Design a protein around this ligand. Structure first.
Ligand SMILES: COc1cc2ncnc(Nc3ccc(F)c(Cl)c3)c2cc1OCCCN1CCOCC1
Lengths: 124, 271
């Protein structure tokens, strides 16, 4: 599914990336936050956590994650927590390890975002 | 040889489903001659540990000794029940939120609103005499119920159990700024509850949902980090303004206890 969207259509990868950029900004702009680069801006887990609350209708208490992570380990914990929120909302366990997102593996990042897009396209 | 067996799930008569959401399903039903509401809880990764915890936490909610507290009548232990389940009496008017914001038949007058405030203050004062405090009750207009004689009652069925995700807050507009940011162990619970009460006063004064134009995530982040506060309404009495301001003090330590605002609200009664 995500093998063809990634590998053998390089200009179509850019189509999905522009679509995902648009979708995450629909929501994160409400917190005065802007995403211009999917390669790095979700790696520390913060925007994934904030995005899940925007998409599923809750606030995440700031003691539940690291709003300003100061280590690789805290970024992994943020991403792992965001994955838990993902499963809370009905998505199946995400395929990538938490570390894959923190290490800016674009395929791991793009898969997680695309699954959020597939589910929440129409949330306003 | 358990101290409680709980309510037998097989004795519940499920009549009509009222709601379903992330937390479970609500049904109107009947049990042992009572008109009841049943909440069937939705829990991911249910376990024997969580089930043990549910069964230790539910008995604390069976509070029959105060008119402004609505007890859990009982709970169905799972196993043997299919899911962990709570039962309470059916409150004909529904929640305070329903009565204030979804009331299609009548608008409660301000004498009734002041009585609601007194009712809630008395129930919360009583709850704060209990040792230890009932873990994780968030005071807001959805967690106060209006009984057949219009008495407002704190809903013990709306507590959050230990296994219900602490990382997802669904009514942040009523939560004190410090409680949006700090673990409950690092906050004074009665001061945090008094902030919630102040927002209830605001809601009773304006007949508006606080921050209705914002998503829950926007509310929590702006209240915690950008100083967003309810706008004190124009043209209310100085006495109501003063009470709202002291209950919503930025310093938790300067907020009054519930038992100190009960006599204030008593003198405000007109009925
Ligand atoms: C008169 O209606 C209610 C009485 C209630 N009385 C007592 N408790 C309620 N809720 C409740 C909340 C949590 C619980 F664990 C349990 Cl056991 C019960 C009640 C919820 C009630 O309504 C729930 C759904 C009301 N909405 C209002 C409009 O939209 C659809 C239905």
């Amino acid at each position: 599914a995500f093998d063809t969207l990634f590998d053998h259509a390089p200009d179509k990868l850019n189509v999905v990336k522009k679509t995902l950029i648009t979708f995450v900004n629909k929501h994160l702009n409400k917190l005065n936050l802007e995403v211009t680069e999917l390669e790095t801006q979700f790696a520390d887990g913060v925007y994934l956590v904030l995005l899940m609350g925007l998409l599923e209708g809750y606030f995440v208490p700031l003691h539940s994650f690291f709003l300003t992570p100061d280590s690789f380990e805290q970024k992994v914990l943020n991403v792992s927590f965001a994955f838990e929120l993902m499963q809370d909302g009905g998505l199946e366990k995400p395929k990538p390890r938490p570390e894959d997102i923190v290490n800016c593996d674009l395929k791991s990042t793009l898969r997680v975002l695309y699954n959020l897009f597939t589910k929440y396209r129409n949330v306003e | 040889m358990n101290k409680h067996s709980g309510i037998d799930f097989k004795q519940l008569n499920f009549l009509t489903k009222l709601n379903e959401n992330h937390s479970g399903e609500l049904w109107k039903g009947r049990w042992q001659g009572n008109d009841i509401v049943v909440k069937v809880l939705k829990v991911r990764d249910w376990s024997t540990r969580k089930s043990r915890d549910f069964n230790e936490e539910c008995p604390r909610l069976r509070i029959f000794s105060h008119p402004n507290v609505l007890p859990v009548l009982g709970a169905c232990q799972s196993p043997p029940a299919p899911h962990p389940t709570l039962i309470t009496h059916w409150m004909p008017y529904g929640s305070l939120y329903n009565v204030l914001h979804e009331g299609t038949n009548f608008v409660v007058d301000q004498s009734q609103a002041v009585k609601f405030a007194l009712d809630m203050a008395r129930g919360m004062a009583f709850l704060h005499t209990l040792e230890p405090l009932i873990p994780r009750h968030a005071l807001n207009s959805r967690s106060v119920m209006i009984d057949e004689d219009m008495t407002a009652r704190i809903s013990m069925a709306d507590v959050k159990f230990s296994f219900q995700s602490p990382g997802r807050m669904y009514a942040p507009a009523w939560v004190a700024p410090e409680a949006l940011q700090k673990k409950p162990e690092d906050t004074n619970r009665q001061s945090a509850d008094m902030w919630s009460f102040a927002v209830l006063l605001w809601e009773l004064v304006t007949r508006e949902v606080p921050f209705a134009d914002l998503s829950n995530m926007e509310i929590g982040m702006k209240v915690a980090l950008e100083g967003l506060r309810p706008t004190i309404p124009p043209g209310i009495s100085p006495h109501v303004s003063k009470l709202m301001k002291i209950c919503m003090n930025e310093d938790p330590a300067k907020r009054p206890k519930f038992d100190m605002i009960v006599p204030i609200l008593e003198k405000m009664q007109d009925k």
